[PDB]
Design a protein around this ligand. Structure first.
Ligand code: TUZ
Length: 92
């Protein structure tokens, strides 16, 4: 609803370090839809416990490969456009 379905359903090619992060949570291809990139990023965040019960909508990614890719120590999962922009920086 923040991001149009057509944009979510577009095939993208992750840059190599984003691909490394996706491959770490079982993703086995060179290209994905934006929606699949976001799914695997979700799986990664939940696996590495980059969250906190005190602030349940904040990803805490400082000193993690995710924080290096996105250029921030933390971000809000409610800011979908800002998150898409951070992912576009990591697509070929
Ligand atoms: C626990 C916490 C921090 O409140 C969290 C942690 C958490 F991992 C997620 C979310 C929320 C969430 O809402 N999600 C979906 C999402 C958000 C933004 C955009 Cl634009 C799209 N998709 C996340 O995924 C959900 C899951 C999945 N899809 O498998 C793990 C189950 C999520 C995914 C990617 C990024 Cl970059 C951020 C959040």
């Amino acid at each position: 609803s923040q991001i149009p379905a057509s944009e979510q359903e577009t095939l993208v090619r992750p840059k190599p370090l984003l691909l490394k992060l996706l491959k770490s949570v079982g993703a086995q291809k060179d290209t994905y839809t934006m929606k699949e990139v976001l799914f695997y990023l979700g799986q990664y965040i939940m696996t590495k416990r980059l969250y906190d019960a005190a602030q349940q909508h904040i990803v805490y990614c400082s000193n993690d490969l995710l924080g290096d890719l996105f250029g921030v120590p933390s971000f809000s999962v409610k800011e979908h456009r800002k998150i898409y922009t951070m992912i576009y920086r990591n697509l070929v």
